[PDB]
Amino acid sequence: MRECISIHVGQAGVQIGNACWELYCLEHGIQPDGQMPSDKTGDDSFNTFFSETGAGKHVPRAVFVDLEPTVIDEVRTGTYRQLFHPEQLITGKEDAANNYARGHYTIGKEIIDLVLDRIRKLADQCTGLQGFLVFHSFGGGTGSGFTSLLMERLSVDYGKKSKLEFSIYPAPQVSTAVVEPYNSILTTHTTLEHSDCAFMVDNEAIYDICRRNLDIERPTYTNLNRLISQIVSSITASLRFDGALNVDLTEFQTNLVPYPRIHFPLATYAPVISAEKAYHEQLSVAEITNACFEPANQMVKCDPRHGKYMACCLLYRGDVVPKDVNAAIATIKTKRSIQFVDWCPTGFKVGINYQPPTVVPGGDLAKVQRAVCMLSNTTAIAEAWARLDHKFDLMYAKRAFVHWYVGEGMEEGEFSEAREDMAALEKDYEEVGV
């Protein structure tokens, strides 16, 4: 059984959600109408993410929420209009206008009950609900504010359930708001005690990979989201194919998060090959494993040689021989600039999914024989928190834009409480890093 419910909040959450469910369907052989031919055993491993109707229709265990309707209307009328039921696609009338306070307080309060009601309808269809996967931006008023309100409400209504995040970290090369450093700090503060594990996706890292490895001069959100979905699928594959590592949401915390507040693992993916380049000699297990320690392949911009490891998981997919993985890991424990923290076990956890990696037809990514996603909890990711905090500090010293938040419910003191919590988080990393 062991079901997982995916929640996509705001434009970034919804659009990445579109790319993910398209890829999940292709991986599991589900058509855009929800029908599936072959399968054969209920006993289908993908039933953790897809419910099955009496007609044999495979329905994603997903909720899509936005405070304005334009993005979700495209889902309602697009290629996957028959995949999701209309009740799973929830929209408001007025967005949060890049304001956390509107998303969380004034506008978010109007749709929270309806969203929770729809989540409850999906939870009732579960016989062993594991928990939730939450997709959202840090920068958006909805992505930041509404997500933190929903995370707070889910911790009360489903106390025993695990909650994982896929968070879109802001970048000037891909940006929408001047106020995004405020929204980022505000959502991090209010979500920190309600999230078990969060995968940050730095828009600059994704932008750099698309330009450097996919030879895309100016990447659109489509280009960025197809790369993000490929990495998200690599992380959730274990939950959809019944492997040996990260088989349940609880295991993500057990394997990657020894210190509860320090729950931000760095994802590194390989190989990223352009579809529009005539392939070459296929990359070996050792080559794709070595690429996991190449900073250029990270989902977050940071220097892991400056940091220390708390945990490390390697998730292989495709034509991967276990002895070849063991030899690749043995080399990493030798040629070691891999320093683990004081009281952590020092081992690498390994998972192998033998299905050939799947890519979107008409996508930018080339089909490969073998791929790997490394999930490492490193103190080097604190560099990303420091960048946000510095931007927050510059504006907050002058109280620039704070009037917008104060006029939308929010107390000025919340800005100081949030920033102090970020200062304590930076100190947590610093204490572990020595």
47 marked among binding-site residues: no
Instruction: Annotate each residue in 166-205 with x if it binds ligand GTP (CB under 6 A) or - if it does not, as one string.
Output: --x-x---xxx---x----------------------x--
The one among 10, 131, 181, 304 contacting ligand GTP by CB under 6 A:
10
DSSP 94-153: S--TT-HHIIIIITGGGTHHHHHHHHHHHHHT-SS--EEEEEEESSSHIIIIIHHHHHHH
User: Choosing among Mg ion, ligand GTP, none, which partner's interface includes residue 12 (Cβ < 5 to 8 Å by kind)?
Assistant: ligand GTP
Minimum CB distance to ligand GTP smaller for 10 or for 307:
10
Q: Are strands 266-270 and 309-318 parallel, antiparallel or unpaired?
A: unpaired
* Subset of 90-109 contacting Mg ion (CB under 5 A): none
Is 307 near ligand GTP (CB under 6 A)? no
* CA max distance for the chain: 63
Cα 309 to Cα 187, 239, 249, 429, distances in angstroms: 25, 24, 21, 11
DSSP 362-379: T-SBPP-SEEEEEEEEEG
Q: What is the dihedral of CA 175, 213, 382, 151, to 10 degrees?
A: 60
Is 11 near Mg ion (CB under 5 A)? yes
Residue with tokens 């495209």: 74
Is 225 near ligand GTP (CB under 6 A)? yes
**8 Å CB contact between 364 and 224:** no
User: Choosing among Mg ion, ligand GTP, none, which partner's interface includes residue 105 (Cβ < 5 to 8 Å by kind)?
Assistant: none
180 marked among binding-site residues: yes
Cα 119 from Cα 106, distance rounded (Å): 21
45 marked among binding-site residues: no
- Decide if 431 is catalytic: no
Cα 59 from Cα 352, distance rounded (Å): 27
The one among 60, 143, 181, 357 contacting ligand GTP by CB under 6 A:
143
140 marked among binding-site residues: yes
The one among 17, 141, 271, 304 contacting ligand GTP by CB under 6 A:
141
68 marked among binding-site residues: yes
**8 Å CB contact between 179 and 412:** no
* Subset of 408-427 contacting ligand GTP (CB under 6 A): none
Cα 209 from Cα 359, distance rounded (Å): 17
User: Choosing among Mg ion, ligand GTP, none, which partner's interface includes residue 92 (Cβ < 5 to 8 Å by kind)?
Assistant: none
Minimum CB distance to Mg ion smaller for 97 or for 352:
97
Residue of 27, 165, 204, 251 marked active site: 251
- Please name the helix (run of DSSP H) or strand (run of DSSP E) that holds residue 286, with its range, or none: helix 285-290
Interacting residues with Mg ion (CB under 5 A)? 11
Known binding-site residues for GTP equal 11-12, 15, 96, 98, 137, 140-143, 174-175, 180, 203, 221, 225
Please identify every residue annotated as catalytic: 251
Known binding-site residues equal 11-12, 15, 39, 41, 44, 52, 66, 68, 95-96, 98, 137, 140-143, 174-175, 180, 203, 221, 225
